[PDB]
Write an enzyme that holds these catalytic residues in place. Structure first.
Site, PDB file in Angstrom:
ATOM      1  N   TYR A  45      -5.625   3.649   4.853  1.00  0.00           N
ATOM      2  CA  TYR A  45      -5.384   3.769   3.400  1.00  0.00           C
ATOM      3  C   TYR A  45      -6.281   4.817   2.777  1.00  0.00           C
ATOM      4  O   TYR A  45      -7.332   5.193   3.330  1.00  0.00           O
ATOM      5  CB  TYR A  45      -5.635   2.419   2.697  1.00  0.00           C
ATOM      6  N   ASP A  56     -12.143   5.728  -1.809  1.00  0.00           N
ATOM      7  CA  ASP A  56     -12.215   5.170  -0.459  1.00  0.00           C
ATOM      8  C   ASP A  56     -11.128   5.742   0.426  1.00  0.00           C
ATOM      9  O   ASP A  56     -10.062   6.135  -0.049  1.00  0.00           O
ATOM     10  CB  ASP A  56     -12.064   3.633  -0.520  1.00  0.00           C
ATOM     11  N   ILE A  75      -8.133  -7.378  -2.231  1.00  0.00           N
ATOM     12  CA  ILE A  75      -7.609  -7.578  -3.587  1.00  0.00           C
ATOM     13  C   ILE A  75      -6.187  -8.159  -3.549  1.00  0.00           C
ATOM     14  O   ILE A  75      -5.439  -7.958  -2.553  1.00  0.00           O
ATOM     15  CB  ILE A  75      -7.682  -6.283  -4.445  1.00  0.00           C
ATOM     16  N   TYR A 101      -9.868  -5.349  -9.191  1.00  0.00           N
ATOM     17  CA  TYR A 101     -11.254  -5.807  -9.398  1.00  0.00           C
ATOM     18  C   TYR A 101     -11.551  -6.273 -10.817  1.00  0.00           C
ATOM     19  O   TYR A 101     -12.696  -6.557 -11.137  1.00  0.00           O
ATOM     20  CB  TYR A 101     -12.255  -4.735  -8.941  1.00  0.00           C
ATOM     21  N   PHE A 118      -3.160   3.340  -4.411  1.00  0.00           N
ATOM     22  CA  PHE A 118      -3.363   3.455  -2.977  1.00  0.00           C
ATOM     23  C   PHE A 118      -2.189   4.006  -2.234  1.00  0.00           C
ATOM     24  O   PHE A 118      -1.038   3.751  -2.603  1.00  0.00           O
ATOM     25  CB  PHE A 118      -3.590   2.047  -2.335  1.00  0.00           C
TER      26      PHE A 118
END
Ligand code: NA
Ligand code: NA
Length: 128
Positions: A45, A56, A75, A101, A118
């Protein structure tokens, strides 16, 4: 760009139908089977914040991210989103903070109330 496109053209995949998790299938995967709750799932990812910053990437670490599906180890948007994917599929998810989050955020890079983008590849899934 891709975050705008999933925001405007994505499929709401939430059971609540609250637009909290939007999905676009970018590369169609294999067969028809999706993982089972409790399966070990292996993903690649990349994540971006709504300001465009990458926060990330598993590709940059040269190893997949591994978790047990549907257990709250990730998540909510991922437990919901990865459960819809076929092996080999690549998708885009646009995740509102209530499925990510929330008001807490996540140090060091995810602020409070963040909508996240993402790109996810489901590499494999296996039962234990
Ligand atoms: Na597009
Ligand atoms: Na799918």
């Amino acid at each position: 760009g891709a975050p705008a496109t999933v925001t405007e053209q994505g499929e709401d995949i939430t059971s609540k139908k609250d637009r909290g998790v939007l999905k676009i299938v970018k590369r169609v995967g294999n067969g028809e089977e999706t993982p089972m709750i409790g399966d070990k799932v292996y993903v690649h990812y990349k994540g971006k914040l709504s300001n465009g910053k990458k926060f990330d990437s598993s590709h940059d670490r040269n190893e997949p991210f591994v978790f047990s599906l549907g257990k709250g180890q990730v998540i909510k948007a991922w437990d919901i989103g990865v459960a819809t994917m076929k092996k080999g599929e690549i998708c885009h998810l646009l995740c509102k903070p209530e499925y990510a989050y929330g008001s807490a955020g996540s140090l060091p890079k995810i602020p409070s109330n963040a909508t996240l983008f993402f790109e996810i590849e489901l590499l494999d899934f296996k039962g234990e």
